[PDB]
Design a protein around this ligand. Structure first.
Ligand SMILES: COC(=O)[C@H]1O[C@H](O[C@@H]2[C@H](O)[C@@H](O)[C@@H](O[C@@H]3[C@H](O)[C@@H](O)[C@@H](O[C@@H]4[C@H](O)[C@@H](O)[C@@H](O[C@@H]5[C@H](O)[C@@H](O)[C@@H](O[C@@H]6[C@H](O)[C@@H](O)[C@@H](O)O[C@@H]6C(=O)O)O[C@@H]5C(=O)O)O[C@@H]4C(=O)O)O[C@@H]3C(=O)O)O[C@@H]2C(=O)O)[C@H](O)[C@@H](O)[C@H]1O
Length: 342
């Protein structure tokens, strides 16, 4: 038995339906009883912030039910200030027990068109991060099943608590899954995108940029998935599995790269095409304002039984033992939370 509290559709011929997703979400009574919204096929040009607990979105189809907006970090607001990376997100989850099923979420910022602009073009944006989905510190127990996330730089921003992505597609270029959250991915296609603006022999991107606090047990955990290239034009050895993001953070002694954000990315039983070269380093600014490099060997970067042409085993690519791999089951990673749909 499954029923819908609200329905969103493009057609007025449907009857008693909402025109926008934002309106349907707003219609929900205040509180924490489950609220389930069906979204019929269509492209909904909307930006959403979810603050109600126990809210659930179900699209008619992943292929056809799309929530999309174009916003880069460097896009300017009315007051002339930048949106910033967090602010660029098409969908922001700032509530508990959210789920989305069978829908696509896009940031439509045209990264390649931006990069193709002449350097003197005042409309050419430097802050090119453009988040599709952001799970915030106030997000915990967020479940995404049969969902497609589309972007280039910084597609998926996972912060705070636990999120679970299942039967999913996620595309991007630089740091397209990033943040300090506990985020588990199962049976997902992670799609590395072509970079027209990157010279032959240089790096096109990085799948992950975890900022997991050293005291947090689990960061980004990718299981039973497929690490694939968008096209044959994506060069061999052009993509890193991860680099360590140490976010600029305000401390008592100033604002600089967080020393204790020693990120975790673990791949288990995941296929990898030959666009993958391994792990990489990442730079930030230290407490003195100097460049500081954070190295993959000092970070929590591991694989277990990778396969496909990108799955090389070497001293630069640490491997889990069977015993260690058993620590990365859904039960262990998500703890007392069992992701369920309404
Ligand atoms: C409640 O939340 C909060 O606590 C805060 O939220 C807000 O802040 C967040 C965040 O917490 C904060 O640290 C800060 O994050 C920024 C940035 O927004 C974020 O996306 C990320 O950025 C990294 C990196 O630091 C950037 O320099 C940039 O990477 C560049 C380049 O863009 C990229 O293409 C690539 O480059 C290629 C090669 O790798 C390179 O060697 C060279 O050859 O160039 C190549 C090229 O093609 O350009 O890597 C570059 C690089 O490594 O520098 O983008 C990455 C990324 O996308 O992940 O981290 C920074 C940071 O400062 O750490 O701001 C966030 C925000 O939302 O704005 C609030 O502001 C805060 O007050 C607080 O509330």
């Amino acid at each position: 038995a499954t029923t819908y509290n609200a329905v969103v559709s493009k057609s007025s011929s449907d009857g008693k339906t909402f025109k926008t997703i934002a309106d349907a979400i707003a219609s929900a009574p205040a509180g924490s009883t489950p609220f389930v919204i069906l979204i019929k096929n269509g492209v909904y040009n909307e930006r959403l912030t979810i603050t109600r607990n126990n809210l659930h979105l179900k699209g008619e189809s992943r292929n056809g039910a799309v929530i999309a907006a174009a916003t880069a970090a460097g896009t300017l607001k009315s007051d002339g200030s930048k949106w910033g990376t967090a602010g660029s997100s098409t969908i922001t989850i700032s509530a508990k027990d959210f789920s989305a099923q069978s829908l696509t979420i896009r940031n439509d910022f045209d990264f390649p068109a931006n990069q193709a602009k002449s350097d003197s073009d005042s409309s050419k944006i430097k802050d090119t991060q453009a988040v599709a989905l952001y799970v915030t510190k106030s997000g915990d127990r967020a479940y995404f099943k049969d969902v497609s996330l589309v972007g280039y730089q910084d597609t998926l921003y996972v912060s705070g608590g636990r999120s679970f992505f299942s039967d999913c597609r996620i595309s991007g270029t630089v740091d397209f899954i990033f943040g300090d959250g506990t985020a588990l991915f199962n049976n997902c296609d992670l799609v590395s995108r072509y970079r027209a603006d990157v010279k032959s022999g240089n790096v096109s991107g990085y799948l992950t940029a975890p900022s997991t606090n050293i005291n947090q047990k689990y960061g980004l955990v990718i299981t039973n998935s497929r690490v694939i290239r968008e096209s044959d034009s994506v060069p061999a050895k052009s993509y890193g599995l991860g680099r360590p993001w140490h976010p600029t953070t305000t401390f008592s002694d100033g604002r600089y790269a967080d020393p204790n954000a020693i990120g975790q990315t673990v791949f288990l039983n995941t296929s990898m095409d030959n666009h993958i070269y391994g792990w990489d380093k990442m730079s930030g600014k230290d407490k003195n304002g100097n460049t500081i490099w954070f190295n993959p060997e000092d970070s929590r970067f591991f694989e277990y039984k990778s396969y496909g042409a990108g799955a090389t085993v070497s001293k630069d690519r640490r491997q889990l033992t069977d015993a260690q791999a058993a620590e990365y089951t859904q039960s262990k990673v998500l703890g007392d939370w069992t992701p369920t749909l309404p």
